[PDB]
Structures are given as C-alpha cells and as structure tokens.
Write an enzyme that holds these catalytic residues in place. Sequence first.
Site, PDB file in Angstrom:
ATOM      1  N   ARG A  11       0.851  -1.194   0.000  1.00 23.80           N
ATOM      2  CA  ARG A  11       0.000   0.000   0.000  1.00 23.80           C
ATOM      3  C   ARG A  11       0.911   1.278   0.000  1.00 23.80           C
ATOM      4  O   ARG A  11       2.171   1.193  -0.038  1.00 23.80           O
ATOM      5  CB  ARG A  11      -0.912   0.014   1.240  1.00 23.80           C
ATOM      6  N   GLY A  12       0.243   2.414   0.081  1.00 21.01           N
ATOM      7  CA  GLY A  12       0.894   3.723   0.250  1.00 21.01           C
ATOM      8  C   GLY A  12       1.954   4.084  -0.808  1.00 21.01           C
ATOM      9  O   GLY A  12       1.762   3.836  -1.976  1.00 21.01           O
ATOM     10  N   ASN A  86      11.203   1.078   1.109  1.00 15.00           N
ATOM     11  CA  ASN A  86      10.123   1.812   1.478  1.00 15.00           C
ATOM     12  C   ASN A  86       9.406   1.395   2.716  1.00 15.00           C
ATOM     13  O   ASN A  86       8.851   2.265   3.390  1.00 15.00           O
ATOM     14  CB  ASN A  86       9.243   1.993   0.282  1.00 15.00           C
ATOM     15  N   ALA A  87       9.584   0.151   3.147  1.00 13.29           N
ATOM     16  CA  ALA A  87       8.892  -0.346   4.294  1.00 13.29           C
ATOM     17  C   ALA A  87       9.274   0.463   5.548  1.00 13.29           C
ATOM     18  O   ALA A  87      10.408   0.865   5.693  1.00 13.29           O
ATOM     19  CB  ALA A  87       9.158  -1.777   4.504  1.00 13.29           C
ATOM     20  N   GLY A  88       8.300   0.776   6.358  1.00 11.28           N
ATOM     21  CA  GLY A  88       8.623   1.448   7.649  1.00 11.28           C
ATOM     22  C   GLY A  88       7.399   1.492   8.521  1.00 11.28           C
ATOM     23  O   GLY A  88       6.255   1.184   8.049  1.00 11.28           O
ATOM     24  N   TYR A 154      11.526   7.202  15.828  1.00  8.01           N
ATOM     25  CA  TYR A 154      11.280   7.275  14.389  1.00  8.01           C
ATOM     26  C   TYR A 154      12.282   8.203  13.708  1.00  8.01           C
ATOM     27  O   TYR A 154      12.862   7.859  12.685  1.00  8.01           O
ATOM     28  CB  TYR A 154       9.851   7.734  14.139  1.00  8.01           C
ATOM     29  N   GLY A 185       7.391  14.831   3.403  1.00  3.90           N
ATOM     30  CA  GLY A 185       6.595  15.452   4.411  1.00  3.90           C
ATOM     31  C   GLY A 185       5.314  14.637   4.623  1.00  3.90           C
ATOM     32  O   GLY A 185       5.272  13.452   4.284  1.00  3.90           O
ATOM     33  N   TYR A 186       4.274  15.343   5.105  1.00  5.33           N
ATOM     34  CA  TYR A 186       3.002  14.642   5.434  1.00  5.33           C
ATOM     35  C   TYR A 186       2.311  14.161   4.178  1.00  5.33           C
ATOM     36  O   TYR A 186       1.848  14.939   3.323  1.00  5.33           O
ATOM     37  CB  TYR A 186       2.080  15.605   6.229  1.00  5.33           C
TER      38      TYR A 186
HETATM   39  N1  LIG Z   1       3.038   8.996   5.097  1.00  9.81           N
HETATM   40  C1  LIG Z   1       3.861   9.949   5.465  1.00  9.81           C
HETATM   41  O1  LIG Z   1       3.474  11.034   5.819  1.00  9.81           O
HETATM   42  C2  LIG Z   1       5.293   9.607   5.420  1.00  9.81           C
HETATM   43  C3  LIG Z   1       6.174  10.715   5.600  1.00  9.81           C
HETATM   44  C4  LIG Z   1       7.542  10.356   5.571  1.00  9.81           C
HETATM   45  C5  LIG Z   1       7.994   9.095   5.297  1.00  9.81           C
HETATM   46  N2  LIG Z   1       7.134   8.081   5.215  1.00  9.81           N
HETATM   47  C6  LIG Z   1       7.743   6.766   4.959  1.00  9.81           C
HETATM   48  O2  LIG Z   1       7.100   6.245   3.800  1.00  9.81           O
HETATM   49  C7  LIG Z   1       7.279   4.811   3.848  1.00  9.81           C
HETATM   50  C8  LIG Z   1       6.013   4.097   3.400  1.00  9.81           C
HETATM   51  O3  LIG Z   1       5.037   4.383   4.377  1.00  9.81           O
HETATM   52  P1  LIG Z   1       3.606   4.844   3.940  1.00  9.81           P
HETATM   53  O4  LIG Z   1       3.458   6.296   4.374  1.00  9.81           O
HETATM   54  O5  LIG Z   1       3.363   4.503   2.475  1.00  9.81           O
HETATM   55  O6  LIG Z   1       2.607   4.048   4.950  1.00  9.81           O
HETATM   56  P2  LIG Z   1       1.749   2.714   4.627  1.00  9.81           P
HETATM   57  O7  LIG Z   1       0.754   2.928   3.532  1.00  9.81           O
HETATM   58  O8  LIG Z   1       1.266   2.291   5.996  1.00  9.81           O
HETATM   59  O9  LIG Z   1       2.870   1.616   4.154  1.00  9.81           O
HETATM   60  C9  LIG Z   1       3.739   1.005   5.118  1.00  9.81           C
HETATM   61  C10 LIG Z   1       4.404  -0.168   4.352  1.00  9.81           C
HETATM   62  O10 LIG Z   1       5.487  -0.790   5.074  1.00  9.81           O
HETATM   63  C11 LIG Z   1       5.264  -2.220   5.087  1.00  9.81           C
HETATM   64  N3  LIG Z   1       5.788  -2.716   6.387  1.00  9.81           N
HETATM   65  C12 LIG Z   1       5.549  -2.167   7.634  1.00  9.81           C
HETATM   66  N4  LIG Z   1       6.106  -2.911   8.589  1.00  9.81           N
HETATM   67  C13 LIG Z   1       6.694  -3.956   7.891  1.00  9.81           C
HETATM   68  C14 LIG Z   1       7.467  -5.159   8.236  1.00  9.81           C
HETATM   69  N5  LIG Z   1       7.720  -5.439   9.513  1.00  9.81           N
HETATM   70  N6  LIG Z   1       7.902  -5.960   7.228  1.00  9.81           N
HETATM   71  C15 LIG Z   1       7.607  -5.727   5.932  1.00  9.81           C
HETATM   72  N7  LIG Z   1       6.929  -4.680   5.538  1.00  9.81           N
HETATM   73  C16 LIG Z   1       6.467  -3.799   6.481  1.00  9.81           C
HETATM   74  C17 LIG Z   1       3.716  -2.355   4.982  1.00  9.81           C
HETATM   75  O11 LIG Z   1       3.370  -3.625   4.455  1.00  9.81           O
HETATM   76  P3  LIG Z   1       2.644  -4.864   5.381  1.00  9.81           P
HETATM   77  O12 LIG Z   1       1.837  -4.151   6.511  1.00  9.81           O
HETATM   78  O13 LIG Z   1       1.773  -5.481   4.224  1.00  9.81           O
HETATM   79  O14 LIG Z   1       3.778  -5.728   5.884  1.00  9.81           O
HETATM   80  C18 LIG Z   1       3.335  -1.236   4.035  1.00  9.81           C
HETATM   81  O15 LIG Z   1       3.411  -1.794   2.714  1.00  9.81           O
HETATM   82  C19 LIG Z   1       7.723   4.468   5.291  1.00  9.81           C
HETATM   83  O16 LIG Z   1       9.071   4.125   5.314  1.00  9.81           O
HETATM   84  C20 LIG Z   1       7.516   5.758   6.023  1.00  9.81           C
HETATM   85  O17 LIG Z   1       8.352   5.915   7.188  1.00  9.81           O
HETATM   86  C21 LIG Z   1       5.800   8.306   5.266  1.00  9.81           C
END
Ligand SMILES: NC(=O)c1ccc[n+]([C@@H]2O[C@H](COP(=O)([O-])OP(=O)(O)OC[C@H]3O[C@@H](n4cnc5c(N)ncnc54)[C@H](OP(=O)(O)O)[C@@H]3O)[C@@H](O)[C@H]2O)c1
Lengths: 238, 237
Positions: A11-12, A86-88, A154, A185-186
């Site tokens: 996702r995401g 990308n995972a986090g 984080y 960002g957000y």
């Molecule tokens: N959204 C924001 O505002 C934002 C801002 C800055 C950076 N980010 C970064 O963007 C990246 C993607 O996050 P997102 O915002 O797209 O959120 P998201 O839609 O919740 O995606 C999180 C992804 O990480 C995977 N993941 C989480 N824990 C995992 C594990 N233990 N093993 C394998 N996969 C795992 C999830 O897959 P499963 O749950 O299917 O395992 C999911 O595909 C992250 O690294 C995050 O820190 C996000």
Amino acid sequence: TSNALVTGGSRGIGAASAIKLAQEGYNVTLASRSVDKLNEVKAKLPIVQDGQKHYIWELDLADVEAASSFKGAPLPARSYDVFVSNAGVAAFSPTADHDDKEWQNLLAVNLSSPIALTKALLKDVSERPVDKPLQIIYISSVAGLHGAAQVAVYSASKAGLDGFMRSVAREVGPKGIHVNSINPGYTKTEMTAGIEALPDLPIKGWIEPEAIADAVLFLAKSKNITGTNIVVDNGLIA
Amino acid sequence: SNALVTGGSRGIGAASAIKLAQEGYNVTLASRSVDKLNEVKAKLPIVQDGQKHYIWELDLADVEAASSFKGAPLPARSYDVFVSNAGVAAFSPTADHDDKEWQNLLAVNLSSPIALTKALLKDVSERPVDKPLQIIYISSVAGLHGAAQVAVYSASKAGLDGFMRSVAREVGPKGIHVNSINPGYTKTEMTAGIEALPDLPIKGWIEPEAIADAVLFLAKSKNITGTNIVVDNGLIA
Ligand SMILES: NC(=O)c1ccc[n+]([C@@H]2O[C@H](COP(=O)([O-])OP(=O)(O)OC[C@H]3O[C@@H](n4cnc5c(N)ncnc54)[C@H](OP(=O)(O)O)[C@@H]3O)[C@@H](O)[C@H]2O)c1
Ligand SMILES: NC(=O)c1ccc[n+]([C@@H]2O[C@H](COP(=O)([O-])OP(=O)(O)OC[C@H]3O[C@@H](n4cnc5c(N)ncnc54)[C@H](OP(=O)(O)O)[C@@H]3O)[C@@H](O)[C@H]2O)c1
C-alpha cells in the site's frame, strides 16, 4: 528485462512507486508481510511490454537475518536494478513512555533491515556497467532532518538511514551503484490516517503517494545523483 | 551538582570527566572496566566541599541495563549533566561487515543512548530556570558526511543526531536542553590504528581535552538546544 524491488509494496508510497515503475517497464517484486494485499497490488501493476512480469515476496522486516539472507526472495539480489527501501513503521509517543520492545522493533524495521538488504545487494551485485547503474532509493522522512516532538525514535531511524546512505554512496559509486534518500513530508497513507489536522504549510494540504513515486522515478532514471536527499514536503522544513 | 559520563575510562570521556570535576561536579564514570574506571576516578579533581565521585560498571551492549539504570550509584534524576560519550567504531566494506558486529555497534552507539535518555526523562524533576538539565551526545562528523567503509558507524551517529533534535524540541519546555558534539579526528585509542590524516584546513590531531572544552561550553550554556557543535579542524567545511 529490468527488475525493481519495492519493500512495503502492499500500500501507500510503495504501492504507488511500484505502479509507476511497472508503467516504465520494470518487472516489480513487491515485498511485505501481507501475501493477499501484495497479490492485490500485483493485479493492478501495469504491463507495458511482452515478457514483463511481477512477483511477490513474503518478508517480515522485523527479522533482520531474513533480510540479510534474501530469505524467500523470488530472484537473486544481483538481478535487481532498482531497490526502493520503502517499508517502515511510525510511532507517536512521549519519549519517556515509549515501550522498549516497540521502539527497538521500530529501529529494526526502519534501519537495521534496510542496512541488511543493502549489504546483501552490494555483496551479490559487486559492480555494474556504466550504462546500467543500480539505483538504491531509501524512503526516509523529513523527521530525520528536523526535530518534531513525540517522534524521537522514528526520527533516529530515518536520520540513521540517511547517514548510512551518504557513506554507502561514497563507497560504492565507483562500482556503479548510486544511493540516495527521498524525505517526504506529510503524505496521505495508512501511516498518517490518525492525523486529523496538518501544520500550516507553504503549500497547503496532504501530499499524495503518487507525488513521492514521481521522485522515485526521477532517481531511478538518474545518472549524476548520489549521496543526497530529495525533499518532497510542501515546504515544511524550508 | 552531578554529571554522568559514559565511556569515562579513557579518551574524550575521561578528559570530559576531569574538566567537569574541575568545575565542581560530582562525576559518575560509567563503562565496562572497573579497574580503569577507578584509575580515572583517582585523577578527578576535588575542588569544592562535600564533592564526591562514583563509578558505574555498565555494558552498553545491554540495552535493558541502560533502560533501567541497572547498577547505577545514583538515580537518573540526580544528574544535571549527561555526557553520552561511550561508543565503538568499526571499519569494513559494507558488503562484508559481520551482522552480529554491526548490530552490536548500533546497540552500543544508538540504542543504549536512547535508553539512557528515556530513563533520565522519565525520572527527572522539571527544571528551574538557572539549572537546566544538559544532555550532550558525543556523535561524529561521520554522521554529517559520507566516509567510505564506516557505513553502520555513520548510521549510528547520524541516528543519534536525529534523536537529539526531536528530544530537544520535546523537552525544552521542561528545562532540559539537548545537543550533539561532532568531533573530527581525535587522538584516542579509537584512532591509534589509523594514521595518515586527510589534508585538513587545521593540520594535525585534535586532543581529547579540546572536545572536553566543548562539553563544558554546553554544560554551562543557556540558549543552545537541538544543535551540533562541530570540532573537526575543518574536515567538513
Ligand atoms: N506517510 C507519510 O506522511 C510519510 C512521511 C515520511 C515518510 N514516510 C515513509 O514512507 C514509507 C512508506 O510508508 P507509507 O506512508 O506509504 O505508509 P503505509 O501505507 O502504511 O505503508 C507502510 C508499508 O510498510 C510495510 N511494512 C511495515 N512494517 C513492515 C514489516 N515489519 N515488514 C515488511 N513490511 C512492512 C507495509 O506492508 P505490510 O503491513 O503489508 O507488511 C506497508 O506496505 C515508510 O518508510 C515511512 O516511514 C511516510
Ligand atoms: N577519536 C575520534 O577521532 C572520534 C571522532 C568522532 C567521534 N568519536 C566518538 O568519541 C566517543 C569516545 O571515544 P574515544 O575517541 O574517546 O575512544 P576511546 O578512548 O576508545 O573511548 C571509548 C569509551 O567508550 C567506552 N565503551 C565502549 N564500548 C562500551 C560498552 N559496550 N559499554 C560501555 N562503555 C563502552 C570505553 O570504555 P570500556 O572499554 O572501559 O567499556 C571507553 O571509555 C565515541 O562515542 C566515539 O564514537 C571519536
């Protein structure tokens, strides 16, 4: 063929990045814990050339030794041309109250597993030709660049990833491996769905995951970019 | 009143402890080595009536020991200055760096500082105006720029700095000020193996006492938080 590995592909930002990479002709390997959600993303990925094909990889990034060994992967590490780390996982807490097993798991998923995956790629790839560098792209955060209250560990994880990135970039550029971070960002995803109001930004509103994916594509096609941060943040930190 | 210095047995930490004891602090020296800790303790100045120094046998590869102040001679809230100085270095091609080794490096350099910090924050009395708590991380210039074959080390020190900025914003209003010092090439046992320097603006090695002067500047400060104090002979300019 060209191959792209996207962790967090279910996702995401990762799903959005996967879609755009498939539109560009890459064979995409989607890696995460959720086989059913991976398969659903896999079913939406563009096909733009005969012979192109996509894959899933059931991978729990809390398990650093699995990352290190590419355990379960559908293809060897040396097959990949683009790695989108990308995972986090996020966590919002007063620092005094953040449960020790929770923040340590956050570090393992956000920092140690990317490190382990990167080591495995560097070992297998060894070196690349000048016409087809390997691009490693960390999805970091603006939290690694400036201090926001109640996201301390984080922030540590993302700042750590960026520090790893600069050192690896200098080490392996001569091998034809280019290494960078994108710092969003957000961005409107599952991770930030609990946020009900944004800060006042120079560019208002949420960023879409597809906007982060356009920055992934910029780096994937790039030639002269390494060791840097591409900040996509609506001016949050300007 | 009380200063905690991890990695107090030698190097930057020992020099920092000497200077803090010169200023009148009761110093707690923490590291793995009880005999070397006692040797440094005997060298610490005593300059004020009632001043007393302590040792604390602490292995920062054990993150849960850090988190609980296991074995500490004083509770966390007794400290007015926390110098997070202990650290370990490792040099390797990234491709070949042993997994247990680089994971242990992250534990010592990053996870234990986070854990000690959380323990202090949880225990502390919100601080009066002329007596803020000062938290000072000894990071590295490696966390600010890329150097080949110290990737996980650099990740640990950059991560420490990202932690530092977020904590600073969070705890400033509680009278807790939080900063990093980022040394360049300093003359300690950590660098005795690696001697040719790069071509620096200021030639030569930095002495551990020089880093200790920066510790003292932060310990006495009032209006500094969330920042890096770079003492590197111009390496990264
Ligand atoms: N959204 C924001 O505002 C934002 C801002 C800055 C950076 N980010 C970064 O963007 C990246 C993607 O996050 P997102 O915002 O797209 O959120 P998201 O839609 O919740 O995606 C999180 C992804 O990480 C995977 N993941 C989480 N824990 C995992 C594990 N233990 N093993 C394998 N996969 C795992 C999830 O897959 P499963 O749950 O299917 O395992 C999911 O595909 C992250 O690294 C995050 O820190 C996000
Ligand atoms: N020297 C440089 O050029 C340089 C440059 C940038 C940053 N630094 C940073 O400066 C800090 C101090 O190192 P230094 O140069 O003064 O090196 P040093 O003289 O070797 O001192 C390292 C200290 O860390 C302690 N330590 C190491 N592992 C530990 C563990 N598992 N548990 C508890 N204590 C431990 C050591 O004590 P025990 O062995 O007694 O446990 C020793 O007191 C480190 O954080 C380092 O990364 C140094």
